[PDB]
Ligand binder design. Structure first.
Ligand SMILES: CC(=O)Oc1ccccc1S(=O)(=O)Nc1cc2c(c(O)c1O)C(=O)c1ccccc1C2=O
Ligand SMILES: [Cl-]
Lengths: 233, 234
């Protein structure tokens, strides 16, 4: 059967994973970097080989991929980057911790955003410290005005990840290419949702572990033949 | 000028230290080599350089150099294209041997001939060579045709398989207005510099490109340099 591996990057700098890092291009913390090395060794020890790699345009995922490729001696593999595998864009909340979020928007609204599949946070306004840093970053310059999010619901995030999966990743899998995907919790959520045909409520409950190879065994229809599996101990 | 092109030769490798012929052997950077690539990156960063696409070989000394550069300039998001065609010259049976071993087996004279010759290849790497499997059977070359997978190369051979990539994959990008970074190897970059400046065989063999230093070209719309290559740094 086809074999697919996913890896979610680990910790980013300045505690930004607990601060709605979203589309801000936070680097890995040294610890986050160590997780990626540990995961790389798991794959080396297991003798995994890949033919193509997919990642986002965010450095925390890219450096995670680099760390894995280094560890398994396949730095020579072709690599494809796409904004479509970016983390969820958290709009105005980006960079705020939990207390600052509650203080600014209230517990009632924050709880609603947290449990909703289709409600976006408020948009990142020009007064936001990250507004121009992200919205005018040249890596998004070719994006149409509607493709470049000011904010995303989980639904929005999954909707823009899947076209890439369908058009670019699927064809590779169907040609027997062994695929590695290094991305983010919410973009990975979209792939896991489509693969296992999960429900909105179920995908919002799924919390993929970080820095750990996630292995899928798929049949000819790209349906999983078993639950996701993890590498390590 | 209409276009700007940046080249960089990989930093010092672990085998450059041991003074062994690497060629297609996938030797990694030495720590100094990594520091060189880093300084190259900082130079590019201080000068405000921006790229849109990166080309490199399938050898990690060039790749890690590119990685180190992309890190220094905060452009890790750029698309990266890897090709064997940008690989170091394939040193055949000399692969793995050092200076002494090479002179010992072949004599100083023969070494002189190979050194100064543009089109005379070293002896072939044969099935009993200790790095034969390591290179000739590495799956990264699985898709090469029988003719393409070399047992050895003269500089001429190297340039001949490197230029096709330049003309078909790099040139169109440049004329598309994409700012190109090429992180590769001495002899593969030699082919590009030879074509750009229209150099003679003797002129190119006399050309020593420094490890880990950025080489900048200002090109006209026909990819002709308006001025001599420039190095970047302090
Ligand atoms: C006897 C031998 O070649 O030793 C080695 C081994 C590694 C590096 C340098 C040497 S060296 O002292 O002889 N000097 C040295 C030797 C050589 C070259 C070169 O540029 C150089 O500077 C080549 O380009 C070269 C190209 C093709 C075949 C052989 C050589 C070669 O043999
Ligand atoms: Cl890469």
């Amino acid at each position: 059967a086809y074999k697919l591996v996913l890896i979610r990057h680990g910790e980013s700098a300045w505690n930004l994973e607990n601060r709605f890092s979203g589309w801000y291009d936070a680097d890995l913390s040294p610890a986050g970097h160590e997780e990626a090395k540990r995961g790389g060794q798991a794959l080396r020890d297991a003798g995994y080989e890949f033919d193509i790699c997919f990642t986002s345009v965010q450095k925390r995922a890219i450096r995670t991929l680099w760390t894995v490729l280094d560890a398994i001696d396949q730095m020579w593999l072709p690599v494809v980057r796409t904004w479509r595998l970016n983390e969820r864009h958290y709009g105005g909340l980006t960079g705020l911790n939990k207390a600052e979020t509650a203080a600014k928007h209230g517990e009632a609204q924050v709880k609603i955003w947290r449990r909703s599949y289709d409600v976006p946070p408020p948009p990142m306004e020009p007064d936001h410290p990250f507004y121009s840093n992200i919205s005018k970053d040249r890596r998004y310059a070719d994006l149409t005005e509607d493709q470049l999010p000011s904010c995303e619901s989980l639904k929005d995030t999954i909707a823009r990840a899947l076209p890439f999966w369908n058009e670019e990743i699927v064809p590779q899998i169907k040609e027997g290419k062994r695929v590695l995907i290094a991305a983010h919790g919410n973009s990975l959520r979209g792939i896991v949702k489509h693969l296992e045909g999960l429900s909105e409520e179920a995908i919002m409950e799924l919390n993929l572990p970080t820095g750990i190879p996630i292995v899928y065994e798929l049949d000819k229809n790209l349906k999983p033949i078993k639950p996701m599996q993890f590498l390590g101990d």
